[PDB]
Amino acid sequence: SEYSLSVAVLADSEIENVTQLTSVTAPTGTDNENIQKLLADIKSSQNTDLTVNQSSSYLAAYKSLIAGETKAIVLNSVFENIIELEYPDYASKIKKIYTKGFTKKVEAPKTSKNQSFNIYVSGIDTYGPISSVSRSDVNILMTVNRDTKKILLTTTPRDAYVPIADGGNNQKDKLTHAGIYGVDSSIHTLENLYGVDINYYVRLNFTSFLKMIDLLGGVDVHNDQEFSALHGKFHFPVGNVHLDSEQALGFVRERYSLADGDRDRGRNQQKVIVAILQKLTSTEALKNYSTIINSLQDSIQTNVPLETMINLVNAQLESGGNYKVNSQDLKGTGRMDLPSYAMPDSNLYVMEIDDSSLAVVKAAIQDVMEGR
Ligand SMILES: CC(C)=CCC/C(C)=C\CC/C(C)=C\CC/C(C)=C\CC/C(C)=C\CC/C(C)=C\CC/C(C)=C\CC/C(C)=C\COP(=O)(O)OP(=O)(O)O
Ligand SMILES: [Mg+2]
């Protein structure tokens, strides 16, 4: 995967190039490896040595820039998406006078040595091409035991206040923000939280989801409470409900009017995962798995190797047998007085994790993996 570091100044700055600078503001406490490589590239190509004025973060460096407290900053493209949360117009306030491309080695999928594996499902809250960066509002761990034919779905509330791995610097913030840093941040955040290996991920957005439901001929669920979605457009009665793509999207996004709010939304998402699974494991869909990949490969990202898809599909085609699916949710207390690493200047709702819930969730994950 690709990212870049840049030297940025204000849009109307008289500074045109890096040789005109003596110093640059940069968060060398937290992004030193990348920063030093940029400084080395600059020294190599422009024979210019810059001293660093340390900032506490990319956000802090940006604030110093617009306040006129520094002439120039280092910007890492990954963290521009974080700056954008507090400063939506940041791109229009700056120009870049130097740019360096970087590549990060992609962490391979982990192959289980046994019958059990974990897939992480990340749902991104935007329409459009799948490369669109947004928050991960769906965060569901699928623990799959092929021996016992059991699946446990563990949802972690998107507001869950947890140490965010990688770009999050292991500081506490709402889980959904990890999706802004990228799927690796999301994955490592949940591996660390639950003490498990996540073997694979699937990342999809609103547009990806609609396309998928369309291709599968809709999905069928049992709806447990009457509710409506999307400003009253869809009405969902109690009982068996068929959902086309638009109905299904409404069905997984509504929270405010549900008896248990965001917890019920998560449960609704789990219902839809089961329903999708029932369509994906029909004889017809399994046979046509190639067509499904071809039709959805542009909109759904995954590191499940092709060989692994082939194996799972063909094993299922030969064996049959449905998975018994159970669901759980990590619990906690909603608070508005705890600091966000990504957005230190905003009062955000976060969910402080309940320790005993965490222990139960981890124990349930291990049990399903070990066949208990
Ligand atoms: C059959 C095969 C392929 C294999 C064999 C299967 C086998 C042998 C075994 C079974 C296990 C395996 C291998 C696979 C199972 C299949 C998998 C991995 C997944 C199926 C499920 C899936 C891909 C998706 C379902 C995800 C889902 C419920 C929703 C996604 C919708 C999105 C993108 C976003 C919603 C965002 C929300 C809630 C609010 C934003 O809304 P907003 O932001 O406006 O609101 P606010 O923010 O304010 O709240
Ligand atoms: Mg959202």
Nearest ligand 1 atom, CA 265: 38
CA 26 from chain center: how many Å?
26
- Residue that has been written with the tokens 């669109």 in this structure: 132
- Residue that has been written with the tokens 């999307």 in this structure: 230
Three-class SS of residue 194? Answer: helix
Instruction: Using the mean position of ligand 1's atoms as its centre, give its distance from the Cα of residue 138 in Å.
Output: 7
Instruction: Using the mean position of ligand 2's atoms as its centre, give its distance from the Cα of residue 176 in Å.
Output: 8
∠ at Cα 125 (6, 207), nearest 5°? 105
Dist CA 252 CA 245 (whole Å)? 11
Instruction: Using the mean position of ligand 1's atoms as its centre, give its distance from the Cα of residue 288 in Å.
Output: 20
186: amino acid identity, one letter: S
Query: DSSP label at 314?
Result: H
Q: Which ligand is nearest to the CA of 267?
A: 1
∠ at Cα 351 (345, 355), nearest 5°? 130
**Pairing verdict, β 94-103 and 171-174:** unpaired
Dist CA 193 CA 196 (whole Å)? 8
Instruction: Using the mean position of ligand 1's atoms as its centre, give its distance from the Cα of residue 252 in Å.
Output: 10
Q: Which ligand is nearest to the CA of 209?
A: 1
Q: Measuring CA to CA, how many Å separate 118 from each of 8, 319, 323? A: 41, 21, 15
Under a CB-based contact definition with an 8 Å cutoff, are residues 197 and 191 in contact?
yes
Instruction: Using the mean position of ligand 1's atoms as its centre, give its distance from the Cα of residue 188 in Å.
Output: 19
Nearest ligand 1 atom, CA 144: 11
State the resolution, in angstroms. Answer: 2.0
Pocket of ligand 1 (CB under 6 A): 119, 121, 123-125, 137-138, 142, 144, 202, 204-206, 209, 252-253, 255, 269, 272-273, 276-277, 280-281, 312-313, 316, 323
Please report which helix (H) or strand (E) contains residue 261, including its range: helix 261-280
Under a CB-based contact definition with an 8 Å cutoff, are residues 171 and 341 in contact?
yes
Task: Please state the three-class secondary structure of 107-175 as a single string.
Answer: CCCCCCCCCEEEEEEEEECCCCCCCCCCCEEEEEEEEEECCCCEEEEEECCCCEEEEECHHHCCEEEEH
Q: Which ligand is nearest to the CA of 123?
A: 1
Under a CB-based contact definition with an 8 Å cutoff, are residues 201 and 120 in contact?
yes
Query: DSSP label at 372?
Result: -
Is 12 annotated in a binding site? The answer is: no
Q: Output the CA torsion 329→331→337→340 (10° steps).
A: -40
Atom 25 in ligand 1: which residue has the minimum CA distance? Answer: 273
Residues having C-beta closer than 5 Å to ion ligand 2: 125, 137
Q: Which domains does the chain have, with CATH numbers?
A: 1-106 (3.40.190.10), 107-372 (3.40.630.190)
Q: Which residues have C-beta within 8 Å of that of residue 362, sequence separation ≥ 6?
A: 194, 195, 196
Q: What is the largest CA-CA distance in the chain?
A: 71
Q: Which ligand is nearest to the CA of 327?
A: 1
What is the best residue among 312, 314, 319 to mutate for testing ligand 1's pocket, by most ligand atoms within 8 Å of CB?
312
